[PDB]
Design a protein around this ligand. Structure first.
Ligand SMILES: CNC(=O)N1N=C(c2ccc(N)c(Br)c2)c2cc3c(cc2C[C@@H]1C)OCO3
Ligand SMILES: CNC(=O)N1N=C(c2ccc(N)c(Br)c2)c2cc3c(cc2C[C@H]1C)OCO3
Lengths: 85, 340, 50, 95, 50
């Protein structure tokens, strides 16, 4: 993008030079960070990185641990009726 | 080159660019070399321009076509055309094949959390065999843990060794399934491409050129992410700055992936496509800058050449040239070594 | 457009996201680019792990 | 008999537990790695199309130095054949 | 898909299109690059209208 001035306009070259000054002083990138990231509604959705995890997830293994302890608990319930009979 | 002469002695991106500009303008041209070799510099004491910028103000040249950074100080003496190639401060790091053997890579199939959770079921089932039937019962339950899940006549102990059998079944099938998933496809896998991640750690060093536009960008930057990058390099020992650009690229290659170099994306993208094919540009650039063509103030070729570049970019000519001397004529062997 | 309100005098300067094109350079004077950009790809990032 | 299955003394009982987890990983590391050489055996071309011949650089390809065949790839405006011509033109050594 | 222009052009499950009238569509039309002209000829003949 750019700023437009009529051909042979007085303020033509002064505005052109004034854009280079704001750029190198970082005022352009600071203002870009203002209305985009700073006042942004997803400033948190820009920091968390999604990468390819090497290891195997713990969640699928949880379905196996919840069926094991579910058997250990059912086992100790039968241990008491066998001790009385 | 010794067997050639005239303009056919040289070749490159700017060489083809000069022919297109002259084609839409209709003049003959000659390719000359700058004397001192270092362009765009104005002495603080004498105020004498040198390089290619001084040859236009002093009339020693008519037009200049080369990767010349567009700055404000140079705009007050000569005329700059619109940018023909965009770039910015990027990150260059060696491509980590990884190819990362070791003991931390053995327990990689299962996750760090499963290796430390299976033991909670081990001691949990060996302690049930105490209850269904201490120095000989743990001696026994471990002798009843190895062989599946000894002397268990009670029905309470029969289903403990059965569910433990199905439980260890899924774990050993899972260990085999995923352990095949990384002898088949390797990413593998590090690191982060962004620049804010490169600053939050001190394991891998990073720096810029000792004197240039890159070091001054971080010095006066008022942005939060870039200021912490400057306070590091200012107090980072040993010297994280290199003398020339050729020393910074040679320092990332001999650092085992423990040193990064920040530079322009044009030079970064060019090194990635050259031997030994190891550097890879990661993450977006940090700032917005571009090159351009320079003509003297009030010259007869200023506006005519400016209007010609905008015709070149629209017809797709510039991107066709960028794709020419960067990726087509590139000696990239990593695109043939990472897929073999 | 805004380029029209510059060649026709109804305004003195146009400050906005104005793409720098050749057909507009021939009629008005463009400053230096105060914001670089290019055509990109927008995809809904999964949101596949449940 | 302790080698075949898994691995009355507490000393040998932990010889039984530990010999299994070692042979358990090897048989998995045999099973998992063996699947990688059969999945790579399914990555054959074998025998691909004329287009895919240009997408890889391990097997080199070229035509005669001058004839109706070489000129075809030169002025072919087709994207597939143009990628082939750009490779053979600058491939070193001479193909 | 990996982040790249060709991985978007190598597959056709996840379709892609641009604006009907604008500088975006005119880019791929007169583009003489191999990767982009493939994307143009895809969307130019893609049904339903992307
Ligand atoms: C039904 N499968 C089964 O019961 N086994 N499968 C086993 C098994 C498990 C997975 C695969 N891929 C293969 Br092949 C065999 C198994 C694997 C072992 C091992 C012992 C076994 C015996 C077990 C619990 O010690 C070393 O690794
Ligand atoms: C030479 N071995 C090797 O390079 N690896 N070992 C691989 C490896 C690790 C363990 C066994 N038992 C076997 Br067989 C192969 C490996 C295993 C992974 C994995 C990545 C790898 C790749 C690397 C770290 O993610 C999850 O599980």
């Amino acid at each position: 993008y750019g700023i437009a001035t009529p051909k042979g306009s007085s303020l033509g070259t002064p505005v052109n030079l004034a854009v280079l000054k704001l750029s190198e002083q970082g005022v352009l990138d600071k203002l870009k960070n203002k209305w985009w990231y700073d006042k942004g509604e997803c400033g948190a959705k820009d920091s968390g990185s999604k990468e390819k995890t090497s290891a195997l997830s713990l969640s699928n293994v949880a379905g196996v641990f919840y069926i094991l302890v579910g058997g250990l608990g059912l086992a100790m319930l039968v241990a008491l009726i066998e001790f009385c009979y | 080159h010794e067997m050639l002469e005239g303009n056919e002695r040289y070749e490159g991106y700017c060489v083809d660019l000069a022919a297109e500009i002259a084609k839409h303008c209709g003049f003959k041209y000659k390719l000359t070399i700058v004397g001192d070799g270092k362009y765009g510099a104005r002495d603080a004491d004498t105020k004498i321009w040198n390089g290619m910028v001084g040859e236009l103000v002093y009339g020693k040249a008519d037009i200049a076509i080369a990767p010349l950074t567009i700055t404000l100080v140079r705009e007050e003496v000569i005329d700059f055309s619109k940018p023909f190639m965009s770039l910015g401060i990027s990150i260059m790091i060696k491509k980590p094949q990884k190819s990362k053997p070791g003991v931390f890579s053995f327990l990689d199939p299962l996750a760090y959390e499963i290796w430390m959770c299976i033991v909670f079921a081990y001691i949990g089932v060996s302690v049930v065999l105490f209850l269904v039937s201490i120095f000989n019962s743990l001696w026994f339950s471990l002798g009843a843990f190895m062989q599946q899940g000894i002397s268990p006549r009670s029905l309470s102990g029969r289903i403990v060794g059965g569910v433990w059998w199905f439980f260890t079944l899924i774990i050993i099938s899972s260990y085999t399934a995923n352990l095949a998933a990384f002898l088949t496809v390797e990413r593998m896998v590090s690191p982060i491409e962004s620049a804010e991640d490169l600053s939050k750690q001190t394991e891998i060093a990073y720096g810029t050129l000792d004197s240039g536009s890159t070091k001054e960008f971080f010095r006066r930057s008022k942005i939060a992410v870039f200021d912490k990058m400057w306070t590091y390099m200012r107090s980072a020992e040993p010297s994280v700055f290199v003398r020339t650009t050729a020393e910074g690229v040679a320092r990332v290659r001999k650092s085992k992936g423990k040193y990064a170099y920040l530079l322009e994306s044009t030079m970064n993208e060019y090194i990635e496509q050259r031997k030994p094919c190891d550097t890879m540009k990661v993450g977006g650039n940090l700032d917005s800058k571009g090159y351009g063509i320079a003509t003297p103030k009030g010259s007869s070729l200023g506006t005519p050449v400016n209007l010609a570049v905008l015709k070149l970019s629209e017809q797709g000519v510039l991107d066709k040239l960028k794709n020419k001397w960067w990726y087509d004529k590139g000696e990239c062997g990593a695109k043939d070594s990472g897929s073999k």
